[PDB]
Design a protein around this ligand. Structure first.
Ligand SMILES: Nc1nnc(SCC(=O)Nc2ccc(S(N)(=O)=O)cc2)s1
Ligand SMILES: Nc1nnc(SCC(=O)Nc2ccc(S(N)(=O)=O)cc2)s1
Ligand SMILES: [Zn+2]
Length: 257
C-alpha cells in the first residue's frame, strides 16, 4: 500500500492513482512574486466557536483530530468560497528535521510542518459525495515554524503517547482549533487536490501567509509517532509530506497587497 518510503512514496503513487499526474495536483510552490493580488477576494470567515472535537486517530499516515460534523457548526466561508464548508478533521504533515516537513512551499522555502483543516461543501450533503466534486472541499493550510511554543497545540501533543501506532485512537473532546490559528488571515488560494491518495481534484486550497510558531519540543513529539502498527517493526512517522507538484495551467491568487 502507499506510504512515504523509498518503495511506496510519492514517486510511486501514480501507478495506483494515475490522477497523481493530473492537471490540478497539490501541493505546489507558491511563487510570491507571481501570485496576483485579487481585490475581489473576500476576508476569510472562520467560525469555530461551536466546533466539537470527538477523537484523535493515528491512521498510519498522520494523526487526525476528528470533529462532529452532523450539525451546522465549525464552518469556513467567504474568502474565495461560494457557500459554506463544514470542518470534519485536521491533521499535520511534518519532517524528520526542522528544515523540511511542509507540503506547500513559499518561494521554495520548506517549513517544519503544515496544518490542514479540512472542510466539506454542505451543498453535497456529506464528505464522501463532496470529494467527487471539483468544489467539494476547502482545506485551510497553516505553516508551522520552530520557535516559541504554541500553547493551544499542547493538548494535541500530550495525547500522542496514547496513539503511537497505526490504528490507535483516543477520545479527544472539547479541543478548540481556534488555538491553532495565526493572528492574520491573509492567504493565497488556488484549485488543487488531496495531497494523499486518492489525490482527488476536489480542493479549493487556502494557505495562510502567517505561520504559527511551535516549540522544538512540540514537533519532536510528532516525530515519536509510528507509521507501523503495534507489534510491527518501528518506523518513525516523519517526512509524511508530498513534494510540490507542477502548477500547470493554474493561477495562485493573494488576498493581500
Ligand atoms: N499485501 C501487501 N500489500 N503491499 C505489500 S508491499 C508491496 C506493495 O504493495 N507495494 C506497493 C503498493 C502500492 C503502491 S502505490 N502505487 O504507491 O500505491 C506502492 C507500492 S504486501
Ligand atoms: N468516501 C470517502 N471517504 N474518504 C475518502 S478519502 C479520505 C481522505 O483521503 N481525506 C483527506 C485526504 C487528504 C487531505 S489533505 N492532506 O488535506 O489534502 C484531506 C483529507 S473518499
Ligand atoms: Zn494534509
Amino acid at each position: 500500500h502507499w506510504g512515504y518510503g523509498k518503495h511506496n512514496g510519492p514517486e510511486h503513487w501514480h501507478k495506483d492513482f494515475p490522477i497523481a499526474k493530473g492537471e490540478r495536483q497539490s501541493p505546489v510552490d507558491i511563487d510570491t512574486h507571481t501570485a496576483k493580488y485579487d481585490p475581489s477576494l473576500k476576508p476569510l470567515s472562520v467560525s469555530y466557536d461551536q466546533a466539537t472535537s470527538l477523537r484523535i486517530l493515528n491512521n498510519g499516515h498522520a494523526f487526525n483530530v476528528e470533529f462532529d460534523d452532523s450539525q451546522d457548526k465549525a464552518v469556513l466561508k467567504g474568502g474565495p468560497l461560494d457557500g459554506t464548508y463544514r470542518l470534519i478533521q485536521f491533521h499535520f504533515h511534518w519532517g524528520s528535521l526542522d528544515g523540511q516537513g511542509s507540503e506547500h512551499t513559499v518561494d521554495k522555502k520548506k517549513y517544519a510542518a503544515e496544518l490542514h483543516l479540512v472542510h466539506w461543501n454542505t451543498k453535497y450533503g456529506d464528505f464522501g459525495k463532496a470529494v467527487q466534486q471539483p468544489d467539494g472541499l476547502a482545506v485551510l493550510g497553516i505553516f508551522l515554524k520552530v520557535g516559541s511554543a504554541k500553547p493551544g497545540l499542547q493538548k494535541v501533543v500530550d495525547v500522542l503517547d496514547s496513539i503511537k501506532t497505526k490504528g490507535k485512537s483516543a477520545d479527544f473532546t472539547n479541543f478548540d482549533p481556534r488555538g491553532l490559528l495565526p493572528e492574520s488571515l491573509d492567504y493565497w488560494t488556488y484549485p488543487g487536490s488531496l495531497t494523499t491518495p486518492p489525490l482527488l481534484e476536489c480542493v479549493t486550497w487556502i494557505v495562510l501567509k502567517e505561520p504559527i510558531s511551535v516549540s522544538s519540543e512540540q514537533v519532536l513529539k510528532f516525530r515519536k509517532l509510528n507509521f507501523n502498527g503495534e507489534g510491527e517493526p518501528e518506523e518513525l512517522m516523519v517526512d509524511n509530506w508530498r513534494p510540490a507538484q507542477p502548477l500547470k495551467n493554474r493561477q495562485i491568487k493573494a488576498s493581500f497587497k
